[PDB]
Amino acid sequence: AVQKVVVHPLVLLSVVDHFNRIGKVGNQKRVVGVLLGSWQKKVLDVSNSFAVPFDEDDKDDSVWFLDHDYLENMYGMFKKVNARERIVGWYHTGPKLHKNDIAINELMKRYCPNSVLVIIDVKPKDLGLPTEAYISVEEVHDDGTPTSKTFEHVTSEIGAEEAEEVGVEHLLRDIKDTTVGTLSQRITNQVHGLKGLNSKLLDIRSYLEKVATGKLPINHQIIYQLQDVFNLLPDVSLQEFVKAFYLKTNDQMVVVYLASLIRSVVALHNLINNKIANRDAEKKEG
Amino acid sequence: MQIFVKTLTGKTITLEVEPSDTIENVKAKIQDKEGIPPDQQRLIFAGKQLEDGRTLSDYNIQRESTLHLVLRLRGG
Amino acid sequence: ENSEKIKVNKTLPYLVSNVIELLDVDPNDQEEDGANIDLDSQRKGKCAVIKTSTRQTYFLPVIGLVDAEKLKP
Amino acid sequence: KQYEKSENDLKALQSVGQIVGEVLKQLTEEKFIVKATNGPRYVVGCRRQLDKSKLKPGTRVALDMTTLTIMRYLPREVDPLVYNMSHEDPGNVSYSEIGGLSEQIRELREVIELPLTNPELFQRVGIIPPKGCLLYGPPGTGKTLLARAVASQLDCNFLKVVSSSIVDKYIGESARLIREMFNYARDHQPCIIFMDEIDAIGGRRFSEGTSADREIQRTLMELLNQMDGFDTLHRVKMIMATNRPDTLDPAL
Amino acid sequence: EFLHAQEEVKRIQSIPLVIGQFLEAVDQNTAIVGSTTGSNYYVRILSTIDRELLKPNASVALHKHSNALV
Amino acid sequence: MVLESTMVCVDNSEYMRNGDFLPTRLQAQQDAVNIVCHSKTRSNPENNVGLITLANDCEVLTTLTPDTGRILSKLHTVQPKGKITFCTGIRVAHLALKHRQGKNHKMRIIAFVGSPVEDNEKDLVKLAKRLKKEKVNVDIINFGEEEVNTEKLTAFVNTLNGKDGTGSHLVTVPPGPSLADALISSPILAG
Amino acid sequence: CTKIINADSEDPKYIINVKQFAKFVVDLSDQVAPTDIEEGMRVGVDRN
Amino acid sequence: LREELQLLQEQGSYVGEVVRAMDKKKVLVKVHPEGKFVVDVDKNIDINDV
Amino acid sequence: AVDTAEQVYISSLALLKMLKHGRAGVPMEVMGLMLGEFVDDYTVRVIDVFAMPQSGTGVSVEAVDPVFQAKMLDMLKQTGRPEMVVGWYHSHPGFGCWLSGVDINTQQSFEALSERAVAVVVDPIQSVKGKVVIDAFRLINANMMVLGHEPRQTTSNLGHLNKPSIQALIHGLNRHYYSITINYRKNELEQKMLLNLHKKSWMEGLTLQDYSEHCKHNESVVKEMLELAKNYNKAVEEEDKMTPEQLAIKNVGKQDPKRHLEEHVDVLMTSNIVQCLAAMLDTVVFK
Numbered sequence A: 001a002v003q004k005v006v007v008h009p010l011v012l013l014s015v016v017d018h019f020n021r022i023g024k025v026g027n028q029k030r031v032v033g034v035l036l037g038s039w040q041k042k043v044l045d046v047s048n049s050f051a052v053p054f055d056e057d058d059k060d061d062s063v064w065f066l067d068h069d070y071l072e073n074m075y076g077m078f079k080k081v082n083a084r085e086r087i088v089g090w091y092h093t094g095p096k097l098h099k100n101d102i103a104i105n106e107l108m109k110r111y112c113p114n115s116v117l118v119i120i121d122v123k124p125k126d127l128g129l130p131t132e133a134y135i136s137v138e139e140v141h142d143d144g145t146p147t148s149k150t151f152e153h154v155t156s157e158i159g160a161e162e163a164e165e166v167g168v169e170h171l172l173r174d175i176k177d178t179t180v181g182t183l184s185q186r187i188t189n190q191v192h193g194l195k196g197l198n199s200k201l202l203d204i205r206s207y208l209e210k211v212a213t214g215k216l217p218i219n220h221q222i223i224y225q226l227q228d229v230f231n232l233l234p235d236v237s238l239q240e241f242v243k244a245f246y247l248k249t250n251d252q253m254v255v256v257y258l259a260s261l262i263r264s265v266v267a268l269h270n271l272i273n274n275k276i277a278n279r280d281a282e283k284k285e286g
Numbered sequence B: 001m002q003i004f005v006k007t008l009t010g011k012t013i014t015l016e017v018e019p020s021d022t023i024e025n026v027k028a029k030i031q032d033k034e035g036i037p038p039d040q041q042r043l044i045f046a047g048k049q050l051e052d053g054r055t056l057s058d059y060n061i062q063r064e065s066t067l068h069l070v071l072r073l074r075g076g
Numbered sequence C: 001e002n003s004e005k006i007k008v009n010k011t012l013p014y015l016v017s018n019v020i021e022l023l024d025v026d027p028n029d030q031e032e033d034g035a036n037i038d039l040d041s042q043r044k045g046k047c048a049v050i051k052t053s054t055r056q057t058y059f060l061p062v063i064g065l066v067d068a069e070k071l072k073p
Numbered sequence D: 001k002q003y004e005k006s007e008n009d010l011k012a013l014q015s016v017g018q019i020v021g022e023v024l025k026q027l028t029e030e031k032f033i034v035k036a037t038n039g040p041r042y043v044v045g046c047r048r049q050l051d052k053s054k055l056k057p058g059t060r061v062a063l064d065m066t067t068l069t070i071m072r073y074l075p076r077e078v079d080p081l082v083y084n085m086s087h088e089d090p091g092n093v094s095y096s097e098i099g100g101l102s103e104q105i106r107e108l109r110e111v112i113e114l115p116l117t118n119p120e121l122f123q124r125v126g127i128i129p130p131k132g133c134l135l136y137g138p139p140g141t142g143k144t145l146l147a148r149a150v151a152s153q154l155d156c157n158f159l160k161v162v163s164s165s166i167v168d169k170y171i172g173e174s175a176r177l178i179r180e181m182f183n184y185a186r187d188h189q190p191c192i193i194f195m196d197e198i199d200a201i202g203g204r205r206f207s208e209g210t211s212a213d214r215e216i217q218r219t220l221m222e223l224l225n226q227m228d229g230f231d232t233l234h235r236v237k238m239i240m241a242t243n244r245p246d247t248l249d250p251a252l
Numbered sequence E: 001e002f003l004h005a006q007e008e009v010k011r012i013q014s015i016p017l018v019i020g021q022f023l024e025a026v027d028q029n030t031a032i033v034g035s036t037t038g039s040n041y042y043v044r045i046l047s048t049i050d051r052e053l054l055k056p057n058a059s060v061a062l063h064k065h066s067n068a069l070v
Numbered sequence F: 001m002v003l004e005s006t007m008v009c010v011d012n013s014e015y016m017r018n019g020d021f022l023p024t025r026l027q028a029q030q031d032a033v034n035i036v037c038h039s040k041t042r043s044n045p046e047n048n049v050g051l052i053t054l055a056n057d058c059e060v061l062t063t064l065t066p067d068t069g070r071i072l073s074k075l076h077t078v079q080p081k082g083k084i085t086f087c088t089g090i091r092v093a094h095l096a097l098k099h100r101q102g103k104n105h106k107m108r109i110i111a112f113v114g115s116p117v118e119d120n121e122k123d124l125v126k127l128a129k130r131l132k133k134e135k136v137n138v139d140i141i142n143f144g145e146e147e148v149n150t151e152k153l154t155a156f157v158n159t160l161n162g163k164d165g166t167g168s169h170l171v172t173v174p175p176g177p178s179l180a181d182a183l184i185s186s187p188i189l190a191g
Numbered sequence G: 001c002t003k004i005i006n007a008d009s010e011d012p013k014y015i016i017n018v019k020q021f022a023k024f025v026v027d028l029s030d031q032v033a034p035t036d037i038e039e040g041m042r043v044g045v046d047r048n
Numbered sequence H: 001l002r003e004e005l006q007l008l009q010e011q012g013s014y015v016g017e018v019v020r021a022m023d024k025k026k027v028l029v030k031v032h033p034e035g036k037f038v039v040d041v042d043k044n045i046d047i048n049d050v
Numbered sequence I: 001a002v003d004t005a006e007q008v009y010i011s012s013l014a015l016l017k018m019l020k021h022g023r024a025g026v027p028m029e030v031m032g033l034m035l036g037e038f039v040d041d042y043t044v045r046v047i048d049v050f051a052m053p054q055s056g057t058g059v060s061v062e063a064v065d066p067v068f069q070a071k072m073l074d075m076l077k078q079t080g081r082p083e084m085v086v087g088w089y090h091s092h093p094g095f096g097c098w099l100s101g102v103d104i105n106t107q108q109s110f111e112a113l114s115e116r117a118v119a120v121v122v123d124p125i126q127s128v129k130g131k132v133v134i135d136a137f138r139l140i141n142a143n144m145m146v147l148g149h150e151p152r153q154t155t156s157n158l159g160h161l162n163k164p165s166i167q168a169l170i171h172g173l174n175r176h177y178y179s180i181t182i183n184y185r186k187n188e189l190e191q192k193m194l195l196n197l198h199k200k201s202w203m204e205g206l207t208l209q210d211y212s213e214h215c216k217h218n219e220s221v222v223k224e225m226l227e228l229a230k231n232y233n234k235a236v237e238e239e240d241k242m243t244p245e246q247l248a249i250k251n252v253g254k255q256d257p258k259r260h261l262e263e264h265v266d267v268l269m270t271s272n273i274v275q276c277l278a279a280m281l282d283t284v285v286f287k
């Protein structure tokens, strides 16, 4: 239904400052706010946000509040001050997918049809992309309940823009990994993404904690993929997968062998370009 | 009677007026305390815009109610 | 106060010109506030195009002190 | 009410005139490249609201004076010589008033009135109707009068030309009108061009005696090319008149 | 640090930009152009332009006020 | 003036659906809400009047707003159908008044109960001592029909205005379908 | 120095003309009468 | 490299055409279509070199 | 008096609202408010920024109804925590930074209630990626301009560090206003979480690259690299010749071999060494 989402770094930042402004409560508060944006060409866009007053008490945690007058007038100001801008859905600060977010989405779907949510990070530590988004799908289906509804993650990335790329690249001024040569790939995804595969091997190790001791629902629809992964584990090293591998090493290295051969001759022509400027000035200048 | 003039600048200005006074006399009293002509001033009482042609009693402004002061804004 | 201020900005060096064409342009779609402008395309009457005697053409959205009825190309 | 006019006059004196330009091509999404009617070519930007896709190469736009960016697109101009050439005739003379030459009246009707109303007959035979025709004869036989019969029939897309207002002492302004008359002619598709006393602009040619008839033969050869050079000359009929057709260019 | 200053120099490549035409160069990194206002100029260049994309009769950008090669 | 915020909790439970009261049970309590929101507005212009429910789905039907045009629009075909759930009615009343724009207002709530409740008296007394630590004064007004000589509500008001509260009451319902404009003349006259 | 096209009634409001540039609406100075500023006559004019 | 940000704001140099020099260190130079200018020389340029 | 060491702290959060609102309506002069937190006579802190609906012309830009202003500030007090208007900004489109004759006028309106309303210009054109040219200002009295008296009584070695542009010096600087040196409030609260959130990927490197065409692309470069080396088998041969400073000015019409010949060697290396290494890890890891 939706291809992907596009998040600007402003709305990425426009939650953190509110997380600072309610950080004096100390005890517990999740930041929940209205997400504004304009989805076009089946691509979800996210532009602007604010945060709505929201509290939560732990005993009987089914009692939420959205001050809709604050939602009515401030969006009416925002529809005034940017008529290109509209509602796109909502968000919450999302540490660990709290329970009220099954009907918050159903509370305010009378504005946005595909009222998408966004889970963000306030304490960043990962090896992935710390912005997560779901979508609302419902089912009268296989086994669980007559009324069943579960969120599904549509893929997420941080979109840039020519206005804000001026800003963020001025705001970094920090340790950087520019000059992409032979080394940026080695550290953006060869040092890093191999350890990125750690926390996904270890993630399914964490579901594996129920062998005879963990939580009481057992499998039914979790193991059809896990049965496939050991089935779609790749081909063993006996076939011409051995032979055609040596074939292309015997082709890819020849281009490197030519290209390195050129590198020696070019700097040797540079060597004479310094022996023309060494000997032809010691008699001239002194 | 006393009134409150609560600006957008966190600041509250107290004035002594009469209920039959016009708004242009109120903005003249702010000019006596600040030095700003009444064209550069906008007075808001409970989300309503005030006009100099009417008095305080037409808008039911009484003793020690709160006004809002926003200034005129023209850039170039 | 207005007739004083008009007299100040009615000051006589006058770069005389020629009326090329007198428009009929429609309001735009879509305009928004925040960067709203009452000067471009909120009314339809009247815009015009002039040519000065320094061989310079100019567009004008606002005519000025003269109205649109008694003007013609 | 007198005060209400004096307040819009306050509202008048914030407006700034805008540079009339023209779009040449489009470099990137924001890099545009234009040339004013003043002079030099400029590289320019636009608004982020004003349809950056619609700026085709060719159109006429408006600019800012201070920052020099595109504020607005505009349609084409209609060059007020030609607007005051178009529809300023209140003449109401008719075919009942002309008399004696009804053979030519039906002859002249055939090129200007018949295929404009019923074109399907020529398409069946397989020939194209004529572009135009001329009227020669001794002076005072009804040459100018016969066009005035047709002039009381159209009123909006009939173009009478005196063939002496089209020349002036600037460099290219004599040939700019002939471009911008026929550009007005294609924009109003049922249209008739009338060209009275073409001997001023027609001529034959010369071995280049004076300096004056340098830039008239340029003004003449612009007319010859705009008739039948690389353009379907369609629905644009031309009527010309003279007292003596001795002094005409054989290429015309 | 050089790559940070490498990209910083193009703030002169802003939007009010006028058009000339390349004519010749006296020497390294200084050239002679002709604007579309009729008058020719002896201008300095900007260093990051590949010099080997010049002179058939090249269209060039010029600065608005200072009127140098852009 | 005096700082409070009047918060009405309407009754859209399914036992309020008949026609024993004369126009409608719905419209009779509606004009009772209409006259008290004219009594709180005209005695204090700062008080906004919005409505909440205490049904199975504790919805913000209308927002807490000083306009009643949304209140007047929703209370027609409001569909008063649903199981009563008053045990979360304390939480949806109290946490609403912490979403207000002023905490220096007096927390004043009225509650309309016109249905048999199935609460635990041991659960509300933990919620009543919760309101002792939250310093909340609620005048509960009984409508409709209920367990007569209202069970668990005398015990809740007593554990509401305890510990030097001594100011809240329990307006009980008479089991007679009379005109309800005279029943609520005691809260509008005094406290 | 310039060349005057015409005067007009009720007011000075002279129409002036220069060599290649535009035509302006001008006024006198204090040091000259409006008498000998008859039409079609070359006159000297400040630059501002 | 970072000098040129504070170097290119210096306005450009005109190009002209020498006709002939004269007494007291000056030359007669005309510009494109602009009139002839009697201008002086700089100290690093010889008159007989012009 | 003041010490010309004013040191306006802003933020990390406000400037992105400044440029986005400044650039979305760039050729018109958009503007807004500055909602911050005052500190002592020396420094000031501006933390939040919001705009208003406006109405403009070419040379002027105005505001509209003041009921937008008070209702906006009430909603920002109840959500978050209350603040106070420390100033105002506007946006010259592609100009630079100065106070024009109308920009100075509404500043004069705002400096009456508090005397430290900071006037801020943001140019979202001149800012390419680095410098963001901003240069906040504040008025000086033209009465002391009449006195010929030089204000602001320099008592710290901090003001005369950044030099003004000549174009802003053509305008009212320095006869009616002054410049202020500023920096940015940076913290792990924000600085860590825009770096480690923006330029990140997940699979772009544990994957192969169009395996039948990468080796095909390893001929799409090498084929013309032969003839480009034939030019390198040409250009060295015309040396021991006319004084190779001449071989700089002359060769600006056409491409040289020598620089272009080491250009593809970097490309023909990293395209191969990455694709060879990334394939030889999946042999180990995947069974």
Ligand SMILES: Nc1ncnc2c1ncn2[C@@H]1O[C@H](COP(=O)(O)OP(=O)(O)OP(=O)(O)O)[C@@H](O)[C@H]1O
Pocket: D097, D098, D099, D100, D101, D138, D139, D140, D141, D142, D143, D144, D145, D146, D242, D243
């Ligand atoms: N056939 C005619 N019937 C009636 N009146 C005529 C006729 N021919 C000419 N006239 C009269 O002669 C006058 C001149 O007409 P017109 O200008 O058309 O002559 P012309 O042929 O155009 O001569 P020229 O080309 O020298 O002007 C008209 O006003 C008309 O009244």
Ligand SMILES: [Mg+2]
Pocket: D140, D143, D144, D145
């Ligand atoms: Mg005739």
Ligand SMILES: [Zn+2]
Pocket: B075, B076, I029, I090, I091, I092, I098, I100, I103
């Ligand atoms: Zn400005």
